[PDB]
Design a protein around this ligand. Structure first.
Ligand SMILES: Nc1ncnc2c1ncn2[C@@H]1O[C@H](COP(=O)(O)OP(=O)(O)O)[C@@H](O)[C@H]1O
Ligand SMILES: Nc1ncnc2c1ncn2[C@@H]1O[C@H](COP(=O)(O)OP(=O)(O)O)[C@@H](O)[C@H]1O
Ligand SMILES: Nc1ncnc2c1ncn2[C@@H]1O[C@H](COP(=O)(O)OP(=O)(O)O)[C@@H](O)[C@H]1O
Ligand SMILES: [Mg+2]
Ligand SMILES: [Mg+2]
Ligand SMILES: [Mg+2]
Ligand SMILES: [Mg+2]
Ligand SMILES: [Mg+2]
Lengths: 98, 523, 532, 528, 232
C-alpha cells in the first residue's frame, strides 16, 4: 500500500497508510460513510488493527447487497442471509487457527 | 498558462465511472415506460406545452442534459426511433445494462479493448441467433398483419381501441405503397398524413380514401359538393405580377393607361381560358388567385382553392392521379386529375374542411383523428406512427421474432452455451453481455408487479429445454406463457436494430477515458 | 532600465517554461497512442460533443495560448496534411526531443552543439531506415495493403472490424486509381465521397461502385430511378431569364409588354428543350431550378437535381464522361447542346437511408468511381468512423505510391535507438551526447505503447532493445530487425510476419518535422511579452 | 462524475492521484532545490529574503533560506524538514541534503513516468544508501595517536573547510582558530549556551575577538554609577540573585502601628534591612557585584562610596557564563557569602566597543566558557557571521566527538558513485538501473561546485570519473586552479558523519516522497 | 524576472509551492547585481556632494514636518526614508562608521559606491563577483599596510594641544561652525582632555553634557568646567 498525504482543515500534514488515521483526517460528510467510519474507529479502539479490512469488507458487502437488490431480492432477505453467513463464518474461523 | 482558463480536463477511472453512471441514469429515467402495463409521463415543454406520453423517444427528446454521455444516449434513442420506429425504450435499457456489466469488469484490471472485442463477438452471435429463431410471415394474410400491429401497439394508450387503430394503420400503409420504374417505396413520411381535429369521439377516427385539407372555396358561388370532379393542380399564381427584369413604362398618350389595365385583364382572361380548355371541375393551386380569375372560372362553373401547401398538393396529386403544372398554356389531358370519386367542403366545428375522399386506387391518404383534446390526439398520432412503422418494417422484411422477452432469453441461453468453448479471457465479458439481455424480461416482470427473481429463475430454467425459444413472460399477468399461443411477436428488423444499436452504444462509451471541455468553437 | 511595457523572461526560466508547455501538450495526447489507446471526448462549452482519437483533431480543437505549445499544434496539423498518419507520434517525439535537449542545455552543453547533434542524428536515422529497415511491397501483394490498412485502423473505433473495413478501403483506393503523364499511378484520395448516416451496425456500411450524392430530386413528380442514365452536368441555374444590370426595359407601346414577359420565360424553356432533345435522363446543376423548369423535367420523365456541390459535380462528370457546361454557347455564337456532352451510368437511384434519401449514381462508364456510406449508432460515432476511414485511406495511398513499408510496434524506434547509440561514439565530442539523447528520445513510442497497455514498460523495452542489439551485432541474426511489441500479450513479436506495417514516409516525415520543431523551439533563450 | 446530491467529502476537497501527482511532487522538489542551488561551495552566493514586515535576511545557510521560504507544497516541505534535521543533528550540509534528495527524485522521474512500481525504487534507494554509508565508514580516514597538536590541526582544517563558503571566508583561518580555541575550553558537554556570541556594530572582521572569560553589555546603570572604579587587578565577584533596593518587604505584607515612635522605627528598620544586606555583601570581600535582579540607586551609591562595582539586571545566561568562567556560585541569599561562593578573575575592566560599553572578565585560568564579540558594518553582516561561526562550532564539536574525516570537494561522492556503479554492474538488472541512477545522482555536488565557480562541469566530471576509476580516492574539484586535485592533500576535510547524515536524510526524504500516491487537501476552516 | 514561477504543472493540475507565490517578486543573478549596484551608486552620488570643506548641506524633513539641516552623512542617511535593501545597507554602513569612529561617515558611502561602480564594469567583462571581492580584499590589505607605513605620530600631551587643535579644526572645517572654527575646536579638545583616563584608556562621553539654548550668538558657545542644569 502507498502512503497518502492528507491536509486537514488546520493545514496539518498527515502522510500515512493507516486507514483509521486517513478516515479521521478526512472531512466525511455523507452519513452512511460516517457510520462505516465509526465502525472502523470502533475496530481500531477494540483491537488496534484491521480498520482497512473493516472498510473493504463493508464496501464489498454493500456492493453485493446492491446487486442482490437489483436482481430481485428484498432488503430483509439480504440482511437475514448476511447475518446467517456471518454466524457461519464466526463458527468456521476457530478451525482455521494454524 | 498553456491551455485557456476555462479549459477543464479530467481522466482516468473517474471518467469511465461517470459515463457509465450517466448512461445508467438515462436508462433509469424511462425504465417504467416499457411493457403493456407501462404508465405515462407528463413532460412540460419549455415553450409552454404539455407532452403526455410513454414513448421512449418522445420522453427523452424533451430532456436537457449536460453530461455528454447522456447526450450520446439521447442520440441513440433518436437513431433507433428514426431507423425502425419501435423499440426505443428497449435499446436505452439494453445499453444501460451492458454498460453496467462492462463497468463491473473495468473495476478490475481488464482493459476496455478486451471488453469491446468480447462485445462485438457477442453481437455477431446475437445477430446469428436472432436470424436462426425467426419465422416467416405471409403478408397476403391480413390477420397476421393485424396481429403484428396489435402486438406493436398493445403497450400504448391506443390499446383500448386496438382493432380500429390496427385497421387504420394497415390500410394507410397498404394504400400508400407505390412502385415506379422498378423501384418500390412506402413513404409514410411525405404521404399518409395524420391530421387531428380535437373533439368528437375516438371511435369516429378513420383513414380517408383520399386527402382532406383545411381549406374553403375562394368565394361562395362555386359548388361545395361535386360528384366526379376533374381536378387540375397548379403551382403558379393566377394573377398579374411583375417580371424579373427592370420593366419601367413611359406613358405619353391618353389611352395608354386604360390599355395597360385592359391588357392586365385580358392576360387574366387568357390564363383562365387556357385552364378552362381542359373542361375541369376543381382547380387547386399553390398560390393566390385573383378575383377576376375567380369570376372567369365561375363562368365555366369551376371550384377553385388557393394557397395550398406544397406537401398537401403533392398528396392530392398522388391521391387523385394528377400532375402539378406551372404554365396553364402547357396543360395536357394527362395532367387532369381523374379518379377522385367525390369532393365535398363541409364544416367541422367552426372551420371548413375540403374532402377528396372517394378516389379509386389512391396512392396517398389522410388519417383523420378525433379525440378528447390536442394532447390525447398527439399521443394517438405517435401511437399510429409506431403502428405504421412496424407495419412497413414487417412488410419489407417478412421475418418475425417472438416477443415478451422470449427472444432475449433464447439469445442469452444460446450465447451462454457458446461461451463454454472459449477458454480465454474474453469469455467472462461475453457471458456477462449475454446475460445482460435478461433485463428486458426483468423489467417486464417488474412493471407487471410480480416477483422478479422467482419468475426469472423459472424462465431461465425453461429456456434450457430442447424447444422453448418462444417462451416469454405474460406482461399483464406475470406468468410464463408460450408466445405462439399468446400471440405477441416482433419484427426481426426491430430486434436486430435494437441489439446492434445498444451494443455499439456500449462500445462507443467504453472507448473513452478522457474528457476535456470549456473551449470555444473557434469558428 | 529597459522600460519595455511587457514581461521579460530569460535564461533557464524561459527554456523550462517552453519545455513544460511542450510536455503538457504531449501528455494531453500520450494516452491515445497504439491499439491499447483510448479515445477522448471533447465538449465545446455549448453542448457540442466530439469523440475522437486523432491527435491532430484533438490539438486543433483545443484552445492553446503558449507559443511553444502552438508550435506543436501546427506541427501535428502539418503532419496530418503532408502524410495523414502519425499525427500523435510526431508530437510525442518532438516533446521528448525538446525535454532531453533542455536537460543537455541545463548540463551546460551549448544549444548549438545539441542542434548539430540532432541534425546529424536525424540524417543518420533517415539513412538507416532507408537502407536497413524498409520492406518492398512487390513480393507481399494485396496482403501488404490489407495489413497496412488494418494497422492504421487499430486504435480507432473501427479497429476490431478491420477485417472488413480494410477490404473496403483497399477496394475504394484501387477503384479511384488513375495514371498521369510520366507513367506514375496516382491515387487521388478525397475523391472518395464519405457519407455518414446513423442507423444499422458498422458492418452494414456500403461501398458504392459509383458515386453517392447527398441530394434529392427537386420535384416529387420525377421518377426516382432511371436505368440507362444519360447524365447532363450543368453549371448554370435554370430559372426565369432576367436581364443583367446594364440592360433596362422601357415600354412606350403597350402591345410589346406581353411579348417581353412571355419571352422572359420562353428563353429558359427553349434551353430546356435544347437540353432534353438529345436524350438526357439525369440533369445535375450547381444552381437552382425554379418550379416551371422542374415541371418541364417532370413531363419529360427525367431526373433533375439542384444545388449540387461543385466538387461532387466535377467528380460525377469525370467518372461518367460528361462535360461541365457553364453555358450553352458554341464557337458559332449559337445556343446548342450536343450528345457528346452526356455522361452515362448503368443506373441512377434515390435510395432511402434511415429516414432520409440520397442519390446513388451506380456504375459510371468510362471511369470507375467509389463512395462509402458509413452506418453508425449516432452522429459522434459516424464522425469518428469518418476520421479513421480517412486515416486508413491516406495510409493506403502512401503505401501504394511509395512502395516501401517498415515494421510497426516500435521496432523502427528501437532499431534506430540502438544504431544511433552505437553511432554517437564516432562523431564529434559534444554532439555525441546530443546524438545519444536523440537515440534515447526515440524510445518514447514503445514506452508509451507499453504504458497504455497497462504493462511493465521497462522490461519489455529492455527485451526489445536486446533483440535489436543482437540483430545489429550478429550478421546472421539480421532477421530480428522486425521484432516489435505485441500489445495484447505483452511480448516481443516479429511484426513483419504479424502483419503490422506502416509507410516509410510516415516515419521519415515524422522524424524530420519533429527534429525541425525541436530545433526551432530550442533556439529561444529570451521571451518578451508585450502587454495588449 | 455526477452531482450526487449528497456528497461524500466536504465541498472544496481537492484530490490528486496517480503518476501525475508524483511527477508534480518531483517537480516541486526540484523547484525547492533550485532556490538554494547557488549557495554551495566557496563560489557560493547569498540570498536576500524580505518578510512581510520589510525586514531583510541575508544568508548562505541552506536551512535558514528554506525556513524563510513559506513553502506550502506538502511534498516540497519534506526537503525543508530534512534540511532542518541536518542542521539539528550535524549543523553543516543543509545545502547538500536538498540537492541530493531533489537529484535522486529527478533521476528516478523517467522510471516513474514508465509506470515502474515505487516499491522497487524505495528498496533500491535503501540498499544503495546502506552500501554508501558502509563505504563511507570503511574509507573514512582516522588517526589513532591521541596527539594534541595533530587533533588541533585536524579541528582547524575542518573548521576552515566548513567556513570557506561564507562572507568570512577571507578570514577563515582566523575564525577557525578562534572556534577551535573556544570549543577546546568547553568541559565535557560542549553546550552552545556556554559560548557567548555578542554582535557589536561597527568595526572590521579582524577586530572581532574571543574573550577568555565572559563579557556583556552595560545594563541600565543608575545615578552614582560613574563614581565606581572601572578597573580591578584582582577582584572577587559576588554573583547574586537579589533585589538590592528599598521596597515592600512582601507583596502581602502590611504594617499596623499606632505610635509615631513605631513609625520611625519602621522606616529605620527598612533602611537597616537594606544596609544589612549591603554590609554583608561589602564584608564578603567582593569588589564586583553582579545581580540578576535590579540593583537600586541607593545600593549603587553605597557601592560607589566603598569603591565597588555593581551591575543589576544582568541576563541569566551571562550570569551562568560568569559563574562558569570565574568559578563562583549564584546566591539568592546574602546571609552566607563565604569565600567559596565568590568568583575570581585576573582583571575586570569596562571598555567602550563601537559606541557601546562592555564589562570584561578576563584572566580566568580555569574558565569553561567563552564569549565571541563580533564586529561588522551592518546587523545582517553580524547575523551571517554568527551563523557561519555556529556552523564551524557545530563541526568542531562533532569532530571532538569522533575524528573521522573524509575529503571534500565532491571527492567522497565520486568514490561513492564509482563504488555504487561497480556494485550495480553485478546484479540482475531491474535494480541495476535504479542503483546506477542513484550513483549518477551522487554526482550533483561536484557538478554544482563547477557550475557555481563558472567552470565547465562536463570536463571536470569526466576527469574526476577517469581519475577515480583508474585509482585515487580523494580527488575533487580544485576551485582556484579550475582543475581537479587530491583534496585530502589540500586539507578540504569534512567529518564523515556529515556525509553519512546527508545521505541518510536525502534517501529517507526521497523514499517518503516516492511512497506517496494520492494527495487529499481538505478546505480551510474559518478563512476569515 | 518576477512573479517567481508560473507553471501550473504540465498535467493541468494546480501547482502551488510558496504561499502567495503569485504576489512575490524575484531577481536572478546578474540583473539583481546590476540593480543593487545602481541603487548604491545613486546613494553614493547623493552623498558625494556633501564631502569636504566646500560640501553643501542636505536639508532633511521627517514625517512630522520637522526640518534638519545637516552635513553629517550618518545623520542624513539615518533620516532618509529608503525602501531598497541596498540603500538600507548603505545607511547601516554609515551608522557603523559613525559608531566606531565618529567621523568619515560620508567617505565610506562614496568609497563603497565607487567600488561597486568599478565592479559593475568588471562584471560586464565576465569576472565572477567572488573574484572581484577577493581582489578588493587584497587591495584593501595593501592600502591599510601603506597607511600604517605613511602614518605620522603626534603628541597627545596636555601641555601642547596644537596638533590636537589642528586635527579638530580639520574635522570641523566641513561643518557650519567653521565661522567659529578655532574656538570651537579648542573647546572640543579641552572638553575631551579634561574628562579622560590618561592611561590611553577610554573617554566616557556621558561625562560630557552637550546642552544647547536658543538666542545669543554661535560665538557665545563656551566650555564650562562644571555642570549646567535647566533648574532654578
Ligand atoms: N402482452 C404482452 N405481454 C408480454 N410482453 C409484451 C406484451 N406486449 C409487448 N410486450 C413486450 O414489450 C416490449 C415492447 O415494449 P414497449 O413499451 O413497446 O417499448 P418500446 O416502445 O421501446 O418498444 C416488446 O419487447 C414485447 O416483447
Ligand atoms: N497491431 C499492432 N500491434 C502493435 N503495434 C501497433 C499495432 N498497430 C499499430 N501499432 C503501433 O502503434 C503506434 C501508434 O499508432 P496510432 O497512435 O494509432 O497512430 P497515430 O500516431 O496516427 O495516432 C504506431 O506507431 C504503430 O506502429
Ligand atoms: N576549498 C574547497 N575546495 C573545494 N570544495 C570545497 C572547499 N571547501 C568546501 N568545499 C565544498 O563545499 C561544500 C559545502 O558548501 P556549504 O554551502 O558551505 O555547506 P553545505 O554542505 O551546506 O553546502 C562541500 O561539499 C565541500 O565539498
Ligand atoms: Mg494492519
Ligand atoms: Mg414499443
Ligand atoms: Mg495512426
Ligand atoms: Mg558547509
Ligand atoms: Mg569629517
Amino acid at each position: 500500500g502507498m502512503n497518502k498525504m492528507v491536509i486537514n482543515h488546520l493545514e496539518k500534514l498527515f502522510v500515512t497508510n493507516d486507514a483509521a488515521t486517513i478516515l479521521r483526517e478526512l472531512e466525511v460528510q455523507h452519513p452512511a460513510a460516517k457510520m462505516i467510519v465509526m465502525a472502523s474507529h470502533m475496530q481500531e479502539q477494540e483491537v488496534g488493527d484491521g480498520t482497512n479490512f473493516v472498510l473493504v469488507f463493508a464496501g464489498a458487502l454493500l456492493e453485493l447487497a446492491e446487486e442482490l437488490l437489483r436482481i430481485g431480492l428484498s432488503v430483509s432477505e439480504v440482511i437475514e442471509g448476511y447475518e446467517i453467513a456471518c454466524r457461519k463464518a464466526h463458527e468456521i474461523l476457530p478451525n482455521l487457527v494454524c | 498558462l498553456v491551455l485557456s482558463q476555462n479549459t477543464k480536463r479530467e481522466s482516468g477511472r473517474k471518467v469511465q465511472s461517470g459515463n457509465i453512471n450517466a448512461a445508467k441514469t438515462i436508462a433509469d429515467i424511462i425504465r417504467t415506460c416499457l411493457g403493456p402495463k407501462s404508465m405515462m409521463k407528463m413532460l412540460l415543454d419549455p415553450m409552454g406545452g404539455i407532452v403526455m406520453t410513454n414513448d421512449g423517444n418522445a420522453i427523452l427528446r424533451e430532456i436537457q442534459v449536460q453530461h455528454p454521455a447522456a447526450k450520446s444516449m439521447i442520440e441513440i434513442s433518436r437513431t433507433q426511433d428514426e431507423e425502425v420506429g419501435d423499440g426505443t425504450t428497449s435499446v436505452i435499457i439494453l445499453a444501460g445494462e451492458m454498460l453496467s456489466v462492462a463497468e463491473h469488469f473495468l473495476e478490475q484490471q481488464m482493459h476496455p479493448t478486451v471488453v469491446i472485442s468480447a462485445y462485438r463477438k457477442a453481437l455477431d452471435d446475437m445477430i446469428s441467433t436472432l436470424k436462426k429463431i425467426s419465422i416467416p410471415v405471409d403478408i397476403s394474410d391480413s390477420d397476421m398483419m393485424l396481429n403484428i400491429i396489435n402486438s406493436s401497439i398493445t403497450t400504448k394508450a391506443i390499446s383500448r381501441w386496438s382493432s380500429l387503430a390496427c385497421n387504420i394503420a394497415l390500410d394507410a400503409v397498404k394504400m400508400v405503397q407505390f412502385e415506379e420504374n422498378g423501384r418500390k417505396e412506402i413513404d409514410i413520411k411525405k404521404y399518409a398524413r395524420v391530421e387531428k381535429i380535437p373533439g368528437g369521439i375516438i371511435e369516429d377516427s378513420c383513414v380517408l380514401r383520399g386527402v382532406m385539407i383545411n381549406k374553403d372555396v375562394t368565394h361562395p358561388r362555386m359548388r361545395r359538393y361535386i360528384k366526379n370532379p376533374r381536378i387540375v393542380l397548379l403551382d403558379s399564381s393566377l394573377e398579374y405580377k411583375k417580371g424579373e427584369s427592370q420593366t419601367d413604362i413611359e406613358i405619353t398618350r391618353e389611352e395608354d393607361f386604360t390599355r395597360i389595365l385592359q391588357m392586365e385583364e385580358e392576360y387574366i382572361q387568357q390564363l383562365c381560358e387556357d385552364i378552362i380548355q381542359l373542361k375541369p371541375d376543381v382547380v387547386i393551386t399553390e398560390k393566390g388567385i385573383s378575383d377576376l380569375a375567380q369570376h372567369y372560372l365561375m363562368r365555366a362553373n369551376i371550384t377553385a382553392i388557393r394557397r395550398v401547401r406544397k406537401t398537401d398538393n403533392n398528396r392530392i396529386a398522388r391521391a387523385c392521379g394528377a400532375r402539378i403544372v406551372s404554365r396553364p398554356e402547357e396543360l395536357r389531358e394527362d395532367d387532369v386529375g381523374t379518379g377522385a370519386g367525390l369532393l365535398e367542403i363541409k364544416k367541422i366545428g367552426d372551420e371548413y374542411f375540403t374532402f377528396i375522399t372517394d378516389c379509386k386506387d389512391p396512392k396517398a391518404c389522410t388519417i383523420l383523428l378525433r379525440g378528447a383534446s390536442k394532447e390525447i390526439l398527439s399521443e394517438v398520432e405517435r401511437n399510429l406512427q409506431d403502428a405504421m412503422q412496424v407495419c412497413r418494417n414487417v412488410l419489407l422484411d417478412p421475418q418475425l421474432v417472438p416477443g415478451g422477452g422470449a427472444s432475449e432469453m433464447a439469445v442469452a441461453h444460446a450465447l451462454t452455451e457458446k461461451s463454454k468453448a472459449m477458454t480465454g479471457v474474453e469469455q467472462w465479458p461475453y457471458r456477462a453481455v449475454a446475460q445482460a439481455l435478461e433485463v428486458i424480461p426483468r423489467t417486464l416482470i417488474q412493471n407487471c408487479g410480480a416477483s422478479t427473481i422467482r419468475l426469472l429463475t423459472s424462465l431461465r430454467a425453461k429456456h434450457t429445454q430442447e424447444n422453448c425459444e418462444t417462451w416469454g413472460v405474460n406482461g399483464e399477468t406475470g406468468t410464463l406463457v408460450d408466445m405462439k399461443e399468446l400471440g405477441i411477436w416482433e419484427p426481426l428488423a426491430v430486434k436486430l436494430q435494437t441489439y446492434k444499436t445498444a451494443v455499439e452504444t456500449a462500445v462507443l462509451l467504453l472507448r473513452i477515458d478522457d474528457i476535456v471541455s470549456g473551449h470555444k468553437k473557434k469558428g | 532600465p529597459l522600460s519595455v511595457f511587457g514581461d521579460r523572461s530569460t535564461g533557464e526560466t524561459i527554456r523550462s517554461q517552453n519545455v513544460m508547455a511542450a510536455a503538457s501538450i504531449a501528455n494531453i495526447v500520450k494516452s491515445s497512442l497504439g491499439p491499447v489507446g483510448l479515445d477522448k471526448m471533447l465538449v465545446d462549452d455549448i453542448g457540442d460533443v466530439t469523440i475522437t482519437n486523432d491527435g491532430a483533431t484533438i490539438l486543433k480543437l483545443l484552445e492553446v495560448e503558449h507559443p511553444a505549445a502552438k508550435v506543436l499544434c501546427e506541427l501535428a496539423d502539418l503532419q496530418d496534411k503532408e502524410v495523414g498518419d502519425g499525427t500523435t507520434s510526431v508530437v510525442i517525439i518532438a516533446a521528448e526531443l525538446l525535454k532531453n535537449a533542455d536537460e543537455l542545455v541545463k548540463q551546460k552543453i551549448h544549444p548549438t552543439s545539441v542542434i548539430s547533434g540532432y541534425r546529424l542524428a536525424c540524417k543518420e536515422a533517415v539513412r538507416y531506415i532507408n537502407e536497413n529497415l524498409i520492406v518492398n511491397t512487390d513480393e507481399l501483394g494485396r496482403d501488404c495493403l490489407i495489413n497496412a490498412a488494418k494497422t492504421s485502423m487499430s486504435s480507432k473505433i473501427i479497429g476490431i472490424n478491420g477485417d472488413f473495413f480494410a477490404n473496403m478501403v483497399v477496394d475504394a483506393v484501387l477503384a479511384i486509381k488513375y495514371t498521369d503523364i510520366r507513367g506514375q499511378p496516382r491515387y487521388p484520395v478525397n475523391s472518395v465521397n464519405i457519407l455518414k448516416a446513423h442507423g444499422r451496425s458498422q458492418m452494414e456500411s456500403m461501398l458504392i461502385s459509383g458515386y453517392a450524392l447527398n441530394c434529392v430530386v427537386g420535384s416529387q413528380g420525377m421518377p426516382k430511378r432511371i436505368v440507362n442514365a444519360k447524365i447532363a452536368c450543368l453549371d448554370f441555374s435554370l430559372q426565369k431569364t432576367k436581364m443583367k444590370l446594364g440592360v433596362q426595359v422601357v415600354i412606350t407601346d403597350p402591345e410589346k409588354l406581353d411579348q417581353i414577359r412571355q419571352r422572359e420565360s420562353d428563353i429558359t424553356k427553349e434551353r430546356i428543350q435544347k437540353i432534353l432533345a438529345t436524350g438526357a435522363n439525369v440533369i445535375l446543376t450547381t444552381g437552382g431550378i425554379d418550379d416551371m423548369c422542374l415541371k418541364y423535367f417532370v413531363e419529360a420523365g427525367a431526373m433533375a437535381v439542384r444545388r449540387v456541390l461543385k466538387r461532387d459535380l466535377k467528380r460525377i462528370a469525370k467518372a461518367s464522361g460528361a462535360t461541365i457546361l457553364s453555358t450553352l454557347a458554341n464557337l458559332e455564337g449559337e445556343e446548342t447542346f450536343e450528345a457528346a456532352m452526356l455522361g452515362q451510368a448503368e443506373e441512377v437511384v434515390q435510395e432511402r437511408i434511415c429516414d432520409d434519401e440520397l442519390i446513388l449514381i451506380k456504375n459510371t462508364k468510362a471511369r470507375t468511381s467509389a463512395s462509402i456510406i458509413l452506418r453508425g449508432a449516432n452522429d459522434f460515432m459516424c464522425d469518428e468512423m469518418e476520421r479513421s476511414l480517412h486515416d486508413a485511406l491516406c495510409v493506403v495511398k502512401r503505401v501504394l505510391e511509395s512502395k516501401s513499408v517498415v515494421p510497426g510496434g516500435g521496432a523502427v524506434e528501437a532499431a534506430l535507438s540502438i544504431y544511433l547509440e552505437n553511432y554517437a561514439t564516432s562523431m564529434g565530442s559534444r554532439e555525441q551526447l546530443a546524438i545519444a539523447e536523440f537515440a534515447r528520445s526515440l524510445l518514447v513510442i514503445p514506452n508509451t505503447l507499453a504504458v497504455n497497455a497497462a504493462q511493465d514498460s521497462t522490461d519489455l523495452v529492455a527485451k526489445l532493445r536486446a533483440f535489436h542489439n543482437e540483430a545489429q551485432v550478429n550478421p546472421e541474426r539480421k532477421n530480428l530487425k522486425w521484432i516489435g511489441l505485441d500489445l495484447s500479450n505483452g511480448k516481443p513479436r516479429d511484426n513483419k510476419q504479424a502483419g503490422v506495417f506502416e509507410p516509410t514516409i510516415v516515419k521519415v516525415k515524422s522524424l524530420k518535422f519533429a527534429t525541425e520543431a525541436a530545433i526551432t523551439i530550442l533556439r529561444i533563450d529570451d521571451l518578451i511579452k508585450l502587454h495588449p | 462524475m455526477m452531482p450526487t446530491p449528497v456528497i461524500l467529502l466536504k465541498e472544496g476537497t481537492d484530490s490528486s492521484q496517480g503518476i501525475p501527482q508524483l511527477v508534480s511532487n518531483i517537480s516541486a522538489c526540484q523547484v525547492i532545490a533550485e532556490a538554494v542551488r547557488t549557495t554551495l561551495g566557496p563560489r557560493g552566493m547569498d540570498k536576500l529574503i524580505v518578510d512581510g514586515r520589510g525586514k531583510a535576511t541575508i544568508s548562505n545557510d541552506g536551512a535558514t533560506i528554506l525556513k524563510l521560504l513559506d513553502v506550502v507544497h506538502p511534498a516540497a516541505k519534506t526537503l525543508v524538514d530534512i534540511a532542518k534535521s541536518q542542521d539539528a543533528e550535524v549543523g553543516d550540509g543543509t545545502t547538500s541534503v536538498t540537492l541530493l534528495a531533489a537529484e535522486f527524485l529527478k533521476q528516478v522521474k523517467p522510471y516513474v513516468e514508465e509506470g515502474l512500481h515505487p516499491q522497487i525504487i524505495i528498496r533500491a534507494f535503501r540498499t544503495a544508501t546502506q552500501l554508501a554509508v558502509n563505504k563511507i565508514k570503511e574509507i573514512a580516514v582516522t588517526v589513532k595517536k591521541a596527539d594534541k597538536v595533530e587533533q588541533r590541526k585536524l579541528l582547524e582544517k575542518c573548521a576552515m573547510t566548513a567556513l570557506s563558503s561564507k562572507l568570512i571566508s577571507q578570514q577563515k583561518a582566523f575564525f577557525a582558530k578562534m572556534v577551535v580555541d573556544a570549543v577546546m575550553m568547553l568541559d565535557d558537554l560542549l553546550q552552545l549556551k556556554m559560548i557567548g556570541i555578542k554582535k557589536v556594530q561597527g568595526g572590521a572582521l579582524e577586530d572581532s575577538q574571543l574573550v577568555a572569560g565572559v563579557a556583556f553589555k552595560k545594563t541600565f546603570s543608575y545615578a552614582g554609577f560613574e563614581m565606581q572604579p572601572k578597573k580591578y587587578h584582582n577582584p572577587k565577584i559576588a554573583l547574586l540573585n537579589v533585589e538590592l533596593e528599598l521596597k515592600a518587604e512582601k507583596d502581602n505584607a502590611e504594617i499596623r502601628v499606632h505610635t509615631v515612635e513605631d513609625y520611625q522605627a519602621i522606616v529605620d528598620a527598612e533602611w537597616n534591612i537594606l544596609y544589612d544586606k549591603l554590609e554583608k555583601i561589602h564584608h564578603s570581600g567582593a569588589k564586583v557585584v553582579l545581580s540578576k535582579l535590579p540593583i537600586g540607586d541607593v545600593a549603587t551609591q553605597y557601592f560607589a562610596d566603598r569603591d565597588m562595582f555593581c551591575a543589576g539586571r544582568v541576563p541569566e545566561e551571562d550570569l551562568k557564563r560568569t559563574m562558569m568562567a570565574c568559578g563562583g556560585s549564584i546566591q539568592t541569599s546574602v546571609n552566607a557569602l563565604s569565600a567559596d561562593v565568590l568568583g575570581r578573575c585576573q582583571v575586570f575592566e569596562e571598555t567602550q566597543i563601537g559606541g557601546e560599553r562592555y564589562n570584561f572578565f578576563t584572566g580566568c585560568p580555569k574558565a569553561k566558557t567563552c564569549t565571541f564579540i563580533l564586529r561588522g558594518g551592518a546587523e545582517q553582516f553580524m547575523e551571517e557571521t554568527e551563523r557561519s561561526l555556529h556552523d564551524a562550532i557545530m563541526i568542531v564539536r562533532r569532530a571532538i566527538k569522533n575524528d573521522s574525516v573524509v575529503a571534500g570537494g565532491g571527492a567522497i561522492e565520486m568514490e561513492l558513485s564509482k563504488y555504487l556503479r561497480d556494485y550495480s554492474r553485478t546484479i540482475p538488472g531491474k535494480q541495476q538501473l535504479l542503483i546506477g541512477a542513484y550513483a549518477k545522482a551522487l554526482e550533483i555536488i561536484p557538478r554544482q561546485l563547477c557550475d557555481n565557480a563558472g567552470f565547465d562541469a562536463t570536463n571536470i566530471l569526466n576527469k574526476l570519473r577517469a581519475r577515480h576509476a583508474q585509482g585515487g580516492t580523494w580527488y575533487g574539484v580544485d576551485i582556484n586552479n579550475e582543475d581537479i586535485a587530491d583534496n585530502f592533500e589540500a586539507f578540504v576535510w569534512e567529518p564523515a558523519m556529515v556525509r553519512i547524515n546527508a545521505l541518510t536524510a536525502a534517501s529517507e526524504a526521497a523514499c517518503l516522497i516516492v511512497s506517496v500516491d494520492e494527495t487529499i487537501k481538505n478546505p480551510r476552516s474559518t478563512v476569515d | 524576472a518576477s512573479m517567481g514561477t508560473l507553471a501550473f504543472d504540465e498535467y493541468g493540475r494546480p501547482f502551488l509551492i510558496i504561499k502567495d507565490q503569485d504576489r512575490k517578486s524575484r531577481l536572478m543573478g546578474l540583473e539583481a547585481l546590476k540593480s543593487h549596484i545602481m541603487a548604491a551608486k545613486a546613494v553614493a552620488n547623493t552623498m558625494r556632494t556633501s564631502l569636504g570643506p566646500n560640501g553643501l548641506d542636505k536639508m532633511m524633513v521627517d514625517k512630522d514636518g520637522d526640518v534638519t539641516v545637516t552635513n553629517d552623512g550618518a545623520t542624513i542617511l539615518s533620516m532618509m526614508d529608503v525602501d531598497h535593501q541596498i540603500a538600507k545597507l548603505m545607511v547601516e554602513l554609515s551608522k557603523s562608521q559613525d559608531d566606531e569612529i565618529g567621523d568619515g561617515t560620508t567617505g565610506v558611502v562614496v568609497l563603497a559606491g565607487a567600488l561597486l561602480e568599478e565592479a559593475e564594469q568588471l562584471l560586464d567583462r565576465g569576472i565572477h563577483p567572488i573574484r572581484i571581492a577577493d581582489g578588493y580584499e587584497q587591495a584593501a590589505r595593501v592600502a591599510i599596510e601603506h597607511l600604517d607605513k605613511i602614518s605620522d605620530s603626534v603628541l597627545v600631551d596636555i601641555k601642547d594641544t596644537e596638533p590636537l587643535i589642528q586635527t579638530a579644526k580639520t574635522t570641523l572645517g566641513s561643518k557650519v561652525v567653521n565661522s567659529c572654527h578655532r574656538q570651537m575646536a579648542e573647546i572640543a579638545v579641552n572638553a575631551v582632555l579634561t574628562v579622560a583616563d590618561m592611561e590611553r584608556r577610554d573617554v566616557d562621553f556621558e561625562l560630557i553634557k552637550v546642552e544647547g539654548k536658543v538666542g545669543g550668538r554661535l560665538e557665545d558657545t563656551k566650555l564650562i568646567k562644571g555642570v549646567i542644569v535647566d533648574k532654578d
